[PDB]
Amino acid sequence: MKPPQFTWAQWFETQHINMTSQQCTNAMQVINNYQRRCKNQNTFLLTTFANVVNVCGNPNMTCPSNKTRKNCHHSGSQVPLIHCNLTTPSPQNISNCRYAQTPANMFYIVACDNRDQRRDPPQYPVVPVHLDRII
């Protein structure tokens, strides 16, 4: 789920593009502090936001996660990424959660939609709103 101050595009960027630290334990604190829980796993794509926006321009395809959605797009080429896996749950005090990190180069499939009319900058009419899968 996402905090109210974020549009879906901004949340996607916060969760899958802006890895604030090359260490998962540190990077995940941002996501976990916003969601109020330690997310079990999360993928950070080592690519730019502009690159993902352009992927939204690739042919539409059915989303692997939802057989009923046709707003997904395949990256075309592979990108470096880091997958974070929770290793230390820390029930309360989510800032004590620790993660493992797995580096890899994979293709990704993103779901894109029209920008949030009121909060997303007009610069990008179409934006990624969900990471559906990495291959």
What residues are labeled active site?
16, 130
Residue 20, annotated as binding a ligand: no
Residue 105, annotated as binding a ligand: no
Question: Could you tell me how many residues make up the chain?
Answer: 135
What is the C-alpha to C-alpha distance for residues 99 and 114, in angstroms, rounded to an integer? Answer: 33
Q: Which two tokens stand for residue 110?
A: 């993103």
* Matching CATH number, 1-135, of 1.20.1530.20, 3.30.1330.10, 3.10.130.10, 3.30.1300.10: 3.10.130.10
What is the C-alpha to C-alpha distance for residues 45 and 27, in angstroms, rounded to an integer? Answer: 13
Residue 42, annotated as binding a ligand: yes
Resolution rounded to one decimal, in angstroms: 1.9
With CA atoms as reference, report the closest residue to 46 among 106, 127, 89, 115.
106
Backbone Cα Rg of the chain: 15
CB 29 within 8 A of CB 22: no
| CA 92 to centroid of chain Cα atoms | 24
CA distances from residue 118 to 58, 114, 115, 125 in whole angstroms, order as listed: 25, 12, 9, 12
What is the C-alpha to C-alpha distance for residues 103 and 87, in angstroms, rounded to an integer? Answer: 16
Residue 70, annotated as binding a ligand: no
What is the C-alpha to C-alpha distance for residues 7 and 122, in angstroms, rounded to an integer? Answer: 13
Residue 40, annotated as binding a ligand: yes
